[PDB]
Amino acid sequence: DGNNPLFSPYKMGKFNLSHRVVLAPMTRCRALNNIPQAALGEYYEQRATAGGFLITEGTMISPTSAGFPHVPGIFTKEQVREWKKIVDVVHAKGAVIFCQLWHVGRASHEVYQPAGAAPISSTEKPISNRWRILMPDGTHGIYPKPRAIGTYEISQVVEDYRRSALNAIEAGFDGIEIHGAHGYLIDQFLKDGINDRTDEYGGSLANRCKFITQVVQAVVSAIGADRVGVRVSPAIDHLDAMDSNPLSLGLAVVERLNKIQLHSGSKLAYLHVTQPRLGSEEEEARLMRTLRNAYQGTFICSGGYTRELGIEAVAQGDADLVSYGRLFISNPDLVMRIKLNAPLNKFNRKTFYTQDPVVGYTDYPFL
Ligand SMILES: Cc1cc2nc3c(=O)[nH]c(=O)nc-3n(C[C@H](O)[C@H](O)[C@H](O)COP(=O)(O)O)c2cc1C
């Protein structure tokens, strides 16, 4: 229970992991002009451990997929070449690493789009004015009205995902994770609070799950199920990503994932789910455990976890792996700290998305 189950081995498909503390995917904006920089190598290397699993910050699948400044991409030859040197560094420490493929959909701005074109989405509805977009100059801005894409374009975006997954393997990544969370493109199709479509991609749960299903199937077909992770967050309302029945949505997605696994004859690397964060906590805990019990595979829980909460989830069978975000920003050796129950360093939100290669990036101290 407390003899630390976070340090009992785990087999995530073909990757034998030595412990269960996972580096959660986090955008840090140091990949200037969408090219992975040496700084990324330094950052990931510091956090890498023998038999530890790291998931990269969101990575672009096309010229139209970004919504933050200086986020890396993996759709060009130049980017793959640069990602490679970073993957080699991490592999030299004996870690397993997945690249997260991210498309922001409507959560963008003309400044992030080629020729200042409008961002794409399942809908023409813009994120509300209650949310603001971080701008290249550090200020914020307004999310514009997106362009609702048709089905032919939906299939092209799917191909963008498939080619990116192939580029990730080319770079040496052990696998990829599909970012189908936090109100981004995929969540814009999943969430009935956003998806107001009248075609075969909207309305019913089946139609709203069509886009994520086709995305996962394409990448599974291209690199193997065992090298694909899927991340979603039905109960997180970020960027107006709300649904009338969070749990029903979550279970419909798991159902499609179990079906993709059955038809392929292989299991996905995992299902990674982000929790919101008492009557509210218990409820979210019930939701998490139910999507876990429903998924025939490895489950990674994330969102507000501490050493204590991570230990508990694994001990109680609520998850097989626990991903850490913010605490991993400020504790390069978070795994070692959790192991020794050594004190943790605070993190500085101010430098989460700044562009300096070191300041608030790789200069947080080790124990
Ligand atoms: C600075 C920052 C950047 C993030 N970038 C991403 C991202 O690119 N993709 C994603 O799926 N989640 C992203 N997240 C959400 C985290 O992966 C994770 O779910 C969250 O940090 C978990 O809670 P914790 O911070 O208490 O560990 C980000 C979070 C932070 C704080």
Curated annotation (Swiss-Prot):
Entry's induction text = By wounding, locally and systemically.
- What are the alphabetically sorted keywords of the record? Fatty acid biosynthesis, Fatty acid metabolism, Flavoprotein, FMN, Lipid biosynthesis, Lipid metabolism, NADP, Oxidoreductase, Oxylipin biosynthesis, Peroxisome
**Subcellular localization(s) per the UniProt record:** Peroxisome
Q: What processes in GO biological process is this protein linked to?
A: jasmonic acid biosynthetic process; oxylipin biosynthetic process
Q: In which pathway does it act?
A: Lipid metabolism; oxylipin biosynthesis
- UniProt-annotated stretches for the region FMN: 325-326
- Positions contributing to FMN binding: P25, M26, T27, G58, Q100, R231, G304, G325, R326
Instruction: Give the similarity note.
Output: Belongs to the NADH:flavin oxidoreductase/NADH oxidase family.
Name of the protein in its database record: 12-oxophytodienoate reductase 3
Organism annotation: Solanum lycopersicum (Tomato)
